[PDB]
Design a protein around this ligand. Sequence first.
Ligand SMILES: N=C(N)NCCCCN(CCCN)C[C@H]1O[C@@H](n2cnc3c(N)ncnc32)[C@H](O)[C@@H]1O
Ligand SMILES: N=C(N)NCCCCN(CCCN)C[C@H]1O[C@@H](n2cnc3c(N)ncnc32)[C@H](O)[C@@H]1O
Lengths: 342, 342
Amino acid sequence: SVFSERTEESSAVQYFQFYGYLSQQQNMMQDYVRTGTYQRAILQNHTDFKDKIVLDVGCGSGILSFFAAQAGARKIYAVEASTMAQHAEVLVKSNNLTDRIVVIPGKVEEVSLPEQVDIIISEPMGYMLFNERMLESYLHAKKYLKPSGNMFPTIGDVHLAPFTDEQLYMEQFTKANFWYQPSFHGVDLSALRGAAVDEYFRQPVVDTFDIRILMAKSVKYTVNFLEAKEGDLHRIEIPFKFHMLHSGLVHGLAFWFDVAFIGSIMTVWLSTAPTEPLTHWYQVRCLFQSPLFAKAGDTLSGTCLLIANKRQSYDISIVAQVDQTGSKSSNLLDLKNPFFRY
Amino acid sequence: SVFSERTEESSAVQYFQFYGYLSQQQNMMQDYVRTGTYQRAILQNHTDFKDKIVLDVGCGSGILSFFAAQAGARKIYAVEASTMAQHAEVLVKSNNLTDRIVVIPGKVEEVSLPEQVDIIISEPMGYMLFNERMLESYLHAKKYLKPSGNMFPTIGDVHLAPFTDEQLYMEQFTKANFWYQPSFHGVDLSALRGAAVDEYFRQPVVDTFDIRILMAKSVKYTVNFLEAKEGDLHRIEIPFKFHMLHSGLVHGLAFWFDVAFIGSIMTVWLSTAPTEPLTHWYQVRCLFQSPLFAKAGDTLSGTCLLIANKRQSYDISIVAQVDQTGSKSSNLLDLKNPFFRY
Ligand SMILES: N=C(N)NCCCCN(CCCN)C[C@H]1O[C@@H](n2cnc3c(N)ncnc32)[C@H](O)[C@@H]1O
Ligand SMILES: N=C(N)NCCCCN(CCCN)C[C@H]1O[C@@H](n2cnc3c(N)ncnc32)[C@H](O)[C@@H]1O
């Protein structure tokens, strides 16, 4: 399929085994901001569901399907690829909704649906929006969408901003410096220090932070899911140009995202910004191996380039330069192996 | 090979990607008990290394090979299957030991050694000794061992003992009762409560604990690595008959292990017992889903059966009965997906 061609089999097994656990389902459902915002987006746009056909892409436990049912959908096809499908079917029976929710086991790239749908709903966002590459399956499912059909969420904004955090930089550098030791039980490890720093700094840091550390207005990159094709997400180029508001060492870039549910009645936002209440996505920070010194008024420019890989993630390349001084930094991150610092 | 026949490819790639990170190697090297005990066993038995040929099975960073070099080995073949082999080669060059340490990339079941060896060294122990099934590779490598050659470690003892921990047992139903909720955002989850309890009890708990919880002298199961064949580890039957020293509810069984390095000069032990200082292996506990009441002086009897699976672990079946009352309990656990509670 379109799914097995872009996905190493090893990565798919680990991925669907992880989402087959009820404990993981629980962890996600207990995020009140996530769950409540989805429910609000769906129930406040009830006209977009009432007597319509809906597709739920990666239904999980089946919670979004239940919300579409609460809003008055005629029928909901809830497609799910893990063994979680069997547990969803149990819930559909015990909440007396077999007349309205049909669980279809399989990947959305491989199953067959009896009709076209009026609207597609999903929670495809990962860390930094793009991790897990579930946006591709969400976009692929537009093949079942009637003309003039809607998608929930409808748009996604990735936000990035430069940050200063000496203590985070020093935690990571200190761990790597284990490999400086000229005589670890009589053995010199120091020839691996370079490799060790690379490995530590390749890992993005997932946790929250005070907005006081951000040193510029954020830059926005927008994906419109109604218009995007699957292929737009194999290579994502995000140019940026920050105007620094504070002088200091810039230790890397912080990422967060917003999605919007653009209904007929109203638009609802789900934000993972650090100014907003916390979600289980936190925020994500990509440290530079060497910090860059920038004076207030200076311009920090460059590119964030995400290239999709077969382990359902992205290789991230960030190249940044201070324009006034020509101080440059280049960094490669591996979004599959993040560091959960919370 | 003998390795790809017993191992799902998906599990092997996750396994060797995990051991290819320097950070994981560092985490194991920073365990002073582990590293120090290996060094002590090797240097204090210098006669078993001086001018001998040695094979290091799963060398990692190569630290055991460097210890065999410190002890006077003529030649050391260090076999390593992850991308860590390339980092080991760098260390061998930068510590000027290319004349004495030869790194061989690949699995020990598939590579070729030029000669037979006097002694084999490895750290094959996982959680509960047997997890990761690396003992099979260690035993397989006896094909390169000269007659009357030694192995380090030489013997392994698994210890089991019944324990009481009401708070651990209760935490499982607390987590599961998230599902016993008739209207979670308008949805009744309660029908999944049973499945959630089952899922929590299939997971062994990895962490440490006060010895005050143990309710009987432990029982020992011994593997002699000089005599054992690969096939002895596919199915491991551990009968037990505990004489209870304390009355109370028995909530499950605790496991830990000891290995011995039996050299010519002295025997050195590496213990992960809860009476001993903590190691990165902690201890492991398998809850019974129904706890058993035992009076001091009563006999708790039964079987612990470990059955090897193709995900490089074991399915664990525990059946226990109190002989005086006829109260029975069984559990099935999946040692691949443990719960890290520490
Ligand atoms: N903490 C984080 N990262 N939170 C954000 C991630 C949460 C994503 N979650 C959706 C939950 C719905 N509310 C994923 C679920 O979608 C299923 N799924 C994945 N890919 C699929 C495919 N190609 N076809 C059909 N189903 C597919 C998967 O099995 C799993 O059940
Ligand atoms: N709690 C924990 N960590 N418990 C487990 C202790 C882990 C010990 N570690 C050795 C490094 C320290 N001496 C494992 C290493 O053995 C390598 N390896 C495994 N199987 C291999 C095979 N069939 N052929 C060749 N190499 C093989 C693996 O790649 C990895 O480097």
